[PDB]
């Protein structure tokens, strides 16, 4: 079993920057690819970014390509999402998920999910 | 923390498989494994998963019960497998203060299975192996919870010894890999081989993790043992043979010597891959097991995007096809040339040559569980309270009594030591065409019977030269010696012409009087020789006597017929007749002597040579003395005096004959030949000849006085001439007789000449007067 | 199902220990893992030693100040499975914590195989382990056994010492036996290799478990006795229990004195193995490590009582087993015994201390200092445990232990090498009978740094050493070769070679060449001296005397004839022919005298010429006289009287030319020949055909002379001297015809030549000069 | 470490017979001697009986000689005490103790103690 905890959210003005962190327990962190999800009230959940099990390759949704970056750290077992150039439509709850047995992104068959973190952008 | 392949169920069975290569030197302390394996790593995992699914879909075997699994990675390394066994037993360890594992299948190496067995038997967990064939694992005092579906290494050693015996390779080299698999096999092989006259030049050992430098010294020593020992027995793993081939390519010794292998290098194409030229002609032995067909159908349809039970599969796709998947969770961006969607797993597909053994081990565990469930609670279909939890001892007792039918249709059943029977196959890596090599089935070994097809090996009677330290030198006289290195190594030398061979390791000389035969086994030959009538040289001498004898008859013809001569009338006729008879006897003496000097003939011969000269010379002395005395008288007195004189010679001859009896004797001059001579002492001939010396001197003394008064013609100086000629003949005969080896022809010639001169000299004046 | 008992002591740092308190499980009991009975030296003294050593360390302010040390002693039972169970118990704390206090290091066990089994598990959790008596050679490979250290050397030095011992006393046919496990196998391998290098043949090799039954030991003893009496010495590189089983088997089979077994540190000076079987072990030589006694351990130990010892859980059972009593009301009372237990019983009586005891104590200090050193680097100024060293790291502790260096209890220095070993030396002990029914171990030697020193007057107490173990007796006497049957080099059979063959190699004889003979010790074929001198020999020298007489015959006749020129008889015939014949006779006598001489080149230069010239020249006078006589009308144009001299000169010149041509055809030189192997003679070369040719010419001349004499016999002239001469010619022809054939077959060529020449010259001279000499007188 | 629990006590008439069971939870039970104590109001806690670790050695006080019986069962880790012909003066609370590292009885060092149970006698 692996437990995921995400943090780093808050209130950020438009055009600012933010950094979200996702930490996982256990000792099998390096064998799971990771992904980020965004869910807004009144809508569904959409994938945002993902990274392979050993870094190397990263994938971003076309909505936030060029503004967001995703990174890993296997030494301290945590992943990072650095999100810049905030936009008013990005106010939502972010989730961190892990997968091991997927196909080409965004079909990854996730098995562990985080609690979530509220991010709101002030106009 | 390594990953694990798990499948849920009511009963969980562990498994150790070598998915990755073992850690190399300088990376063994961290226990960091190498690259993925296909035949040994992943086909095993897929087959176990499919076998469990098939069992769970079978209502006859274990109805109303599902079976799970927990497959870990042993990496063909002992420490990693020990860690994974600790992971198995952690559940029981913390419960003593997740469903427990009831049994373990694997691993595949003897040196690791021993430690796994120790740790597992500490907790009463039965273990079944499919590829560990060491002889020391069949000791239930030490390894009680260990069973295997394959035979031991004693049969492999017997098969190897049978092959090397059949091909008459009596001087080989040996090499084995470290660990109890190599050591036990090599020691059994040498113990069996020492009893059939097979000698080992040297024995070596090496690790499979050894570097390039360590593999070069081994080949250097093996080359140093060339060119005699060009056959190398190998109780080695696949990696050891691979390292040997790489080393011999590095130093350029392809084709220098043949190498003989075991099931470690049985049919695996990765042992000879890119190094086929360095391994052509090698002979290997393998376990007999046909290919499982229903595994291929399942395996060849697997794709990376739909397999959700194997992470090593997603790594293996990229490793095998040398590409990187597009956006998969395990992209491994090291590669380029992204994977295609038309890459099938059925291209260049070769199945593991030990798949049936793994499947049979899994089925054996399942059948043991089924029998245990049936025995504990008969009327229930499911996990009854009488088997909650499962006792390890009861399961072990049930497993020892299990017999069933395998995938190949044969019957699997364990003996008192937990082993299972099996047979072997003989392979031969050769070249079939142009840039095309393959393993070809050649023969078989089964229950002590080895039958091998030698017409398709070497294709002719001109096979490899028998690896022999010394070539045989059984020439019938050549004698062998061993310096002291190895009994197979020897050097041999010719024997003496006099010596005869006793055995190979000894050479003996024949005794006197015999010579070794053609075969030199015995020696009884060189018979005596006489050459009495077959020798031309004596024969002519007989002629010299023969006509001479006739001449004597002439002397008798005139004297008997004519008596009116005043000179003849005055001289005594009895004395002349006596001397003529003596001359005739002297002539006949050589004829008696020449032919077959036997015992009876020699006795007459010894008397004759001393008889005729004595009486004839004595008569001459009496006649001259009577004339000198005049210048008693009756002729009767002269005859009596002559008879008295000769009786002394006869008495001396008789006394000499009595002292030395006449008999046949054998004379051996030298080793070359042996002759036969009469037993004639030197004194036996010195004494009679010396008697005539006084007789001869008497005539010389009386000759001086008779020369003053010549009467009735007669011959005065002729007596002196006869004495001088006799003395000259004797003086010539003395040195040659004691120097020459024969001493027969010389005596014959001397006596014939003496008789001839005695007859001719003192008789021709009377013949001339008569004529 | 029932846990074993552990001896624990509280502290800040906990150190484990594994000791063999009980005997190992016997066969038919290994599966249940049921141990035997308690032990005196190997099991109960070491527990108290560790407890007191930690207590002493805790009272030392200089070593690890403000830190307390605890411990846990467990039972290994000299068995691998029990020790594996106890090691799992050791590591269970950390194993649970990953998902009480952890163990930072382990001391022990005492056997190589069990140590390997424990190390394999321990190295995965980074726990350094220090051994005190596990001396296997293969435990020094840090690639496999990285966290292993020891304060004792490996057994390679023991193998070297044993090989030196067997070399010194000339054991060459020695049997071998070892015990199952890493220790015995490795040591026996090393011993086999060194013995093979040094030239020692092993009769056979055997192995056996120390847990085997009586039948196995009986079979082993029968196999060992199958090689008697050749292999009288057995190298036993085995444990104490194997040696004790061998002794029991020897007693059962009624064997004593038939063997001299040479042991190792397993049986070093322990009285356990030779209790009740002393008679079967007298004269055995063994090797032990060098370690003196510890006195404070004795002071502490000899005062322990069962009713006040609340630290050792195995002490009441120990007391009852040792004193064969039962403690009346004690909680751990065993009712098997009887007679109860006295209150005056003391542990001082029959006290013998463990022979490795100091080593154990060292293994407890070596760890402690290590920790101390670590505490001096992680927290420099602080005293006590700190956050920088909480928890203790296994790798840092291992790298600190690998660098440790201190002084031991015996005053020596303890420091590890690159393989985690420590230096040491060995003592050579001898078990013998001292008094009446009194046996003891006597120190007789030492081995250190490749140097062995022993006193040989203490072993065997005399110079009559036990019959050395040899397969074959040395029978090389300087003329005998040894040969091998291919089985064992030490076994051979010796046979003689030929008398003329000298022993070039110890395995084969070589024959000398012609003219050479082997020396006294058959080493060197010196040239055989040549015997040629015959001046003093009786047979030739006497002949020379005869020739000397002939010399007088030459001197007197010539003198008389020379001064009688006025006599008509001398003037009747030409004086030239008489002088020529006299010169020929003189030259013949001179050649006869010169024939007996050393075969020098100058001597042989004239020997060939002289042998033929003299008879040819001397008899030329005869043919000249016959021709002169026949020149007259009665004998019969060539009326010249002086024509006789020129004809003789022409004949002499022709003979000289023939002789010179023969001489030129083959120059003469001294030649050495070997008619036999032991006979060598030096004579100047002269071909038979070379000698024959001058003889034929002289024979033809003589034959021509006889024809002239026969025709002239009837003619009377010069006092009827023509009737003479003919007799001399006839005698000369007869003697020459007799000499011709006897020369070839004679074995004394020169003797025959000189005798024949002298006889011919004398006969001619006399038979031709006696009438003239008588007429002159 | 072991935990000792008591059972079998209660109220009985005079002359009755009782069986008290002391059960030890935890292994290493066979290596501990056992003893029984009783305490009554107005007096002090005094030992009544004891048994050695392996059995075969039993000790009783002079007051309860010929009436009490102490026995062990190492298969089920339970020690039993049998009282016969009980007297009104035996009404007291009874405790079960485990001892190791001791001397002649009653000089034992008891490492662990039990809960205890009340026994009352009615005439
Ligand atoms: N002076 C002198 C002297 C010194 C020693 C020995 C002899 C002697 O006996 N000569 C001889 C005479 C006869 C003979 C034969 C037939 C008829 C008459 C005589 N034969 N021989 C003879 C001797 C040796 C070997 C061969 C033959 C003479
Ligand atoms: N019998 C071998 C098994 N084995 O070794 C290899 O190298 N391949 C393989 O199957 C052993 O016991 O180790
Ligand atoms: N060096 C021996 C130690 N040892 O073995 C015995 O039998 N006694 C003893 O001290 C070993 O390596 O095991």
Judged by phi (left if over 0) then psi (alpha if -120 to 50, else beta), residue C436 lies in beta
Element (H, E) at B439: strand B437-446
- Measured from the Cβ of residue B708, the count of other Cβ atoms closer than 10 Å reads 9
In this structure, what are the phi and psi dihedrals at residue B552, rounded to the nearest 5 degrees? Answer: -60, -40
Q: CA geometry: angle at B13 spanning B11 and B15, to 5°?
A: 165
Contact B75, B23 (CB under 8 A): yes
Q: In this structure, is residue D11 part of a structural domain?
A: yes
Question: At D85, which CATH number?
Answer: 2.60.40.10
d(CA C607, CA B149): 105
> What is the CB neighbour count within 10 angstroms for residue C362?
24
Could you tell me which of C263, C238, C258, C281 has the C-alpha nearest to residue C166?
C263
Beta-sheet pairing, B171-177 with B199-206: parallel
The pairing of strands D78-83 and D18-25 is antiparallel
| Cis amide prior to B227 (ω within 30 degrees) | yes
The neighbour count for residue C183, using CB atoms within 10 Å, is: 27
- Short-list B246, B249, B256, B192, CA closest to B223: B256
Q: Which residues have a Cβ under 8 Å from the Cβ of B449 and sit 6 or more positions away?
A: none
Q: Which of B379, B417, B298 is nearest to B49 (CA)?
A: B298
Is B354 annotated as contributing to ligand binding? yes
The tally of domains found in chain A comes to 1
Read off φ and ψ for residue B454, nearest 5 degrees.
Answer: -90, -10
Per-residue tokens: C110: 């005492």
Cα B482 off chain centre by: 12
Query: Does an H or E element contain A72, and which?
Result: strand A68-73
Residue B134 is classified by DSSP as: -
Residue C338 touches partner D, C-beta closer than 8 Å: no
Q: Burial, B175: exposed, middle or buried (Cβ in 10 Å; 0-12, 13-18, 19+)?
A: buried
Distance CA C559, CA C546 (A): 20
Strand partners, A11: A120
Instruction: Report the residue of chain D nearest C4, measured CA to CA.
Output: D28
Burial of B645 (0-12, 13-18, 19+ CB in 10 A): middle
Centroid of chain to Cα C499: 24
Contact yes or no for A29/A103 (Cβ under 8 A): no
Residue B426 contacts residue B283 (beta carbons within 8 Å): yes
Taking CA atoms only, the protein residue closest to ligand 2 atom 9 is B264
Number of H helices, E strands in chain B: 20, 22
**What is the three-class DSSP state of C431?**
strand
Q: How was this structure determined?
A: cryo-EM
What is the DSSP secondary-structure string of C137-173?
GGGG-TTT--SEEESS--THHHHHHHHHHHHHTT--E
C-alpha–C-alpha distance, residues C245 and C213, integer Å: 9
Gap between the Cα atoms of C174 and D23, Å rounded: 64
Residue C533: closest CA among C683, C324, C395: C683
To the nearest 10°, the Cα dihedral for B406, B409, B411, B417? Answer: -50
DSSP per position, chain D:
--EEEEE--EEEETT--EEEEEEEESS--TT-EEEEEEE-TTS--EEEEEE-TTSS-EEE-STTTTTEEEEEETTTTEEEEEE-S--GGG-EEEEEEEE-S--STT---EEEEB--EEEEEE-
Residue with tokens 């003919």: C726
- Asked if B28 and C483 come within 8 Å (Cβ–Cβ), the reply is no
Pair B105, B137: CB distance under 8 Å: no
Please give the Cα distance from B196 to B167 (Å, whole number). 13
The whole-angstrom separation of Cα B487 and Cα B468 is: 11
Cβ–Cβ of D52/C331 closer than 8 Å?
yes
Radius of gyration, alpha carbons of chain D: 14
Query: How many whole angstroms from C213 Cα to the centroid of ligand 3?
Result: 21
- What does the block give as tokens for B315? 């790594």
Q: Residue D4 pairs with which residues in a beta bridge?
A: D24, D114
* Nearest C-alpha neighbor of B62 from the set B403, B386, B380: B380
Q: Where are the alpha helices (DSSP H) in B348-478?
A: 355-376, 392-399
Q: Which atom of ligand 3 is nearest to the CA of C239?
A: 7
Give C204-254 as a 3 state SS string.
Answer: EEEEECCCCCHHHHHHHHHHHHCCCCCCCEEEEECCHHHHHHHHHHHHHCC
Query: Does A touch D (3+ CB pairs < 8 Å)?
Result: no
Residues pairing with C445 in the sheet: C428, C454
| Cβ-based burial of B37 (10 A; exposed 0-12, middle 13-18, buried ≥19) | buried
From residue C637, give the alpha-carbon distance in Å to each of B303, C633, C643, C709: 147, 10, 11, 21
How many C-beta neighbours within 10 Å does residue C49 have? 22
Separation CA C7–CA C16 (nearest Å): 10
Decide if A65 is inside a domain. Answer: yes
Burial D70-99 (b: 16+ CB within 10 A, else e): bebeeeebbbbbebeebeeebbbbbbbbbb
| Cα–Cα distance measured from residue B500 to residue B643, given in angstroms and rounded to the nearest whole number | 62
Distance CA(A49)–CA(A83), nearest Å, equals 11
Q: D interface toward C at CB cutoff 8 Å?
A: 27-33, 52-54, 56-57, 59, 99-105, 107-109
For residue B527, with 0-12 CB atoms within 10 Å meaning exposed, 13-18 middle and 19 or more buried, which class applies? exposed
Burial B137-160 (b: 16+ CB within 10 A, else e): bbeeebbbbbbbbbbbbbbbbbbb
Residues of A in contact with B311 (CB under 8 A): 31, 100-101
Residue A108 belongs to some domain of the structure: yes
Q: Do C397 and C128 meet the contact criterion of CB atoms below 8 Å apart?
A: yes
The whole-angstrom distance between B265's CA and the closest CA on chain A is 34
DSSP state, C467? P
B83/B71 Cα distance (integer angstroms): 13
Domain enclosing residue D86, as ranges: 4-118
Residue C300 host element (H or E): helix C295-301
How far out from the chain centre does Cα B485 lie? 15
Closest CA to B169 of B258, B263, B255, B265: B258
Contact B396, B127 (CB under 8 A): no
Omega within 30 of 0 (cis) for the link into C109: yes
CA C379 vs CA B727, C373, C530: distances in Å: 135, 10, 100
Dihedral class, residue C575 (left if φ above 0, else alpha if ψ from -120 to 50, else beta): alpha
Q: Six-digit token pair at C187? A: 């040591």
Q: Which two tokens stand for residue B77?
A: 């390394």
Distance from CA of A102 to the nearest CA of B (A): 6
The pairing of strands B146-148 and D110-113 is unpaired
Angle at B736 between CA B732 and CA B742, to 5 degrees: 135
* Assigned token pair, B211: 């570097």
Experimental structure resolution, Å? 2.9
- Looking at all shown ligands, the one closest to residue B726's CA atom is 1
- CB atoms inside a 10 Å sphere around CB B71: 25
C-alpha atoms less than 13 angstroms from C-alpha of C42 in its C-beta half-sphere: 22
Closest residue by Cα to residue B16 from B84, B93, B91: B84
Cα atoms in the 13 Å half-sphere on the side-chain side of B713:
16
* φ and ψ of D24, to 5 deg: -110, 125
Q: Which residues contact B260 (CB under 8 A, 6 or more apart)?
A: B160, B163, B164, B231, B232, B233, B234, B282, B283, B284
Structure tokens at C322: 């040792």
User: B145 C-alpha vs ligand 2 centroid, how far in Å?
Assistant: 20
User: Is the CB of B333 less than 8 angstroms away from the CB of A57?
Assistant: yes
Three-state DSSP class for C494? strand
First and final CA of chain C: distance in angstroms?
A: 153
Beta carbons of C105 and C367 less than 8 angstroms apart: yes
Q: Distance (Å, rounded) from C-alpha B241 to C-alpha B269?
A: 12
**What separation in angstroms does the CA of C273 have from each of C243, C248, C277?**
7, 10, 8
Please check whether residue A123 lies inside any domain of the structure: no
> Cβ–Cβ contacts within 10 Å for residue D114, how many?
20
Contacts of C739 in chain B (CB under 8 A): 732
The string of DSSP codes covering C550-568 is HHHHHHHHHHHHHTTTTSH
Which ligand does the CA of C42 lie closest to?
Answer: 3
Chain B CA closest to residue C494 = B506
Contact C132, C367 (CB under 8 A): no
- Name B189's Cβ contacts closer than 8 Å, sequence gap at least 6: B157, B160, B161, B174, B233, B235
Please give the Cα distance from C259 to C247 (Å, whole number).
11
d(CA B336, CA C478): 83
Q: Note whether residue D123 is domain-resident.
A: no
Give dist(CA C282, CA B690) in Å, integer.
86
CA angle C407, C408, C414 (to 5 degrees): 65
Q: How many Å apart are CA C113 and CA B479, to the nearest integer?
A: 52
Q: How far apart are CA B44 and CA C473, in angstroms?
A: 64
Q: Residue A30 CB: number of other CB atoms within 10 A?
A: 12
How far is B36 from B637, CA to CA, in rounded Å?
142
Cα B702 vs. chain centroid, distance in angstroms?
Answer: 87
Element (H, E) at C682: strand C681-684
> For residue D27, which of D53, D55, D1, D54 has the smallest C-alpha distance?
D1
Q: In chain C, which residues have their Cβ closer than 8 Å to the Cβ of B397?
A: none
What's the CA gap between B62 and B374, in Å, rounded?
Answer: 9
Question: Under a CB-based contact definition with an 8 Å cutoff, are residues D64 and D85 in contact?
Answer: no
Q: Residue C517: left if φ>0, alpha if ψ -120 to 50, beta else—which one?
A: beta
Neighbours of C329 (CB within 10 A): 17
Which residues in chain A are contacts of B330 at CB distance < 8 A?
33, 52-53
Which DSSP string corresponds to C564-628?
Answer: TTTSHHHHHS-HHHHHHHHHHHHHHHHHHHHHSS---HHHHHHHHHHHHHHHHHHHHHHHHHHHH
Strands C103-107 and C129-131: parallel
**How many residues does the structure list for chain A?**
123
Cβ–Cβ < 8 Å for A102, A109: yes
Mutate to test the interface with B, among A1, A2, A57, A79 (most CBs of B within 10 A): A57
């Amino acid at each position: 079993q692996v437990q995921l905890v995400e943090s780093g959210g808050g209130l950020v003005q438009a055009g600012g920057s933010l950094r979200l962190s996702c930490a996982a327990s256990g000792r099998t962190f390096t064998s799971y690819a990771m992904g980020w999800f965004r869910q807004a009230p009144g809508k569904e959940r959409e994938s945002v970014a993902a990274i392979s099990s050993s870094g190397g390759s990263t994938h971003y949704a076309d909505s936030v390509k060029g503004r967001f970056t995703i990174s890993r750290d296997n030494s301290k077992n945590t992943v990072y999402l650095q999100m810049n150039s905030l936009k008013p439509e990005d106010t939502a709850v972010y989730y961190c998920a892990a997968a091991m047995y997927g196909s080409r992104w965004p079909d990854w068959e996730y098995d562990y999910w985080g609690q979530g973190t509220q991010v709101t952008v002030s106009s | 923390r390594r990953v694990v392949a798990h499948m849920p169920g009511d009963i969980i069975i562990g498994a150790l498989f070598s998915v990755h290569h073992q850690p190399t030197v300088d990376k063994v302390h961290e226990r960091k494994c190498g690259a993925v394996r296909e035949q040994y790593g992943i086909q095993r995992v897929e087959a176990m998963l499919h076998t469990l699914e098939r069992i769970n879909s079978d209502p006859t075997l274990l109805p109303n019960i599902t079976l799970g699994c927990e497959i870990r990675d042993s990496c063909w390394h002992s420490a990693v497998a020990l860690e994974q066994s600790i992971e198995f037993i952690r559940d029981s360890l913390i419960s003593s203060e997740k469903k427990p594992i009831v049994g373990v299948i694997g691993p595949g190496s003897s040196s690791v299975a021993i430690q796994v067995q120790n740790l597992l038997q500490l907790f009463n967990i039965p273990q079944i192996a499919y590829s560990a064939t060491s002889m020391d694992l069949s000791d239930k005092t030490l390894f009680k919870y260990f069973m295997r579906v394959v035979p031991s290494d004693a049969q492999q050693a017997r098969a190897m010894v049978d092959i090397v015996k059949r091909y008459n390779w009596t001087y080989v080299s040996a090499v084995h890999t470290e660990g109890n698999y190599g050591e036990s096999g090599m020691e059994a092989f040498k113990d069996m081989s020492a009893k059939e006259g097979i000698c080992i030049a040297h024995s070596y050992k090496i690790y499979s993790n050894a570097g390039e430098q360590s593999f070069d010294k081994l080949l250097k020593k093996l080359t140093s043992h060339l060119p005699k020992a060009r056959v190398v027995a190998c109780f080695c793993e696949g990696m050891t043979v691979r390292g040997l081939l790489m080393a011999m390519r590095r130093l350029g010794l392809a084709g220098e010597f043949l190498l003989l292998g075991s099931d470690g290098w049985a049919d695996r194409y990765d042992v000879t891959d890119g190094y086929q030229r360095e391994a052509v002609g090698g002979i290997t032995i393998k376990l007999q097991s046909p290919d499982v067909k229903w595994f291929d159908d399942y395996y060849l349809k697997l794709r990376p995007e739909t397999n959700h039970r194997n992470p090593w599969f997603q790594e293996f796709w990229q490793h095998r096809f040398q590409c990187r998947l597009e956006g998969f969770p395990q992209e491994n961006s090291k590669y380029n040339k992204t994977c295609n969607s038309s890459l099938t797993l059925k291209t260049h597909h070769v199945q593991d040559s030990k798949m049936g053994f793994v499947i049979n081990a899994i089925y054996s565990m399942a059948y043991g569980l089924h029998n245990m469930q049936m025995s504990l609670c008969p009327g229930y279909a499911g996990l009854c309270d009488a088997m909650k939890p499962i006792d390890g001892r009861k399961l072990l007792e049930s497993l020892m009594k299990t017999n069933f039918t395998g995938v190949s249709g044969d019957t699997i059943l364990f003996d008192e030591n937990g082993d299972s029977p099996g047979r072997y196959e003989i392979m031969n890596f050769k070249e079939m065409g142009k840039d095309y090599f393959d393993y070809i089935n050649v023969g078989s070994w089964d229950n002590g019977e080895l039958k091998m097809d030698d017409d398709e090996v070497w294709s002719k009677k001109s096979n490899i030269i028998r690896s022999v330290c010394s070539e045989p030198c059984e020439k019938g006289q050549i004698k062998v010696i061993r310096k002291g290195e190895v009994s197979c190594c020897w050097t041999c030398t010719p024997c003496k012409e006099n010596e005869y061979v006793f055995d190979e390791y000894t050479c003996k000389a024949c005794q006197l009087g015999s010579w070794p035969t053609d075969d030199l086994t015995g020696c009884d030959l060189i018979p005596v020789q006489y050459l009495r009538w077959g020798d031309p040289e004596p024969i002519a001498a007989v002629v010299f006597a023969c006509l001479g004898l006739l001449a004597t008859l002439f002397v008798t013809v005139v004297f008997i017929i004519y008596r009116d001569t005043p000179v003849v009338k005055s001289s005594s006729r009895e004395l002349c007749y006596i001397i003529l008879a003596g001359i005739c006897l002297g002539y006949l003496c050589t004829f008696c002597l020449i032919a077959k000097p036997k015992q009876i003939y020699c006795y007459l011969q010894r008397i004759g040579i001393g008889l005729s000269p004595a009486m004839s010379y004595s008569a001459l002395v009496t006649k001259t003395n009577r004339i000198a005395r005049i210048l008693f008288m009756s002729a009767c007195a002269q005859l009596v005096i002559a008879f008295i004189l000769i009786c002394i010679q006869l008495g001396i001859i008789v006394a000499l004959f009595i002292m030395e009896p006449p008999d046949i004797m054998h004379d051996y001059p030298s080793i070359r030949e042996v002759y036969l001579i009469c037993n004639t002492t030197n004194l036996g001939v010195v004494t009679p000849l010396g008697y005539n010396g006084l007789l001869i001197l008497s005539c010389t003394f009386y000759a001086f006085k008779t020369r003053n008064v010549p009467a009735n013609f007669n011959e005065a100086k002729y007596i002196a001439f006869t004495m001088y000629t006799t003395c000259i003949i004797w003086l010539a005969f003395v040195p040659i007789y004691f120097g020459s080896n024969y001493k027969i022809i010389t005596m014959c010639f001397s006596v014939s000449l003496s008789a001839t001169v005695a007859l001719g000299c003192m008789f021709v004046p009377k013949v001339y007067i008569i004529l």
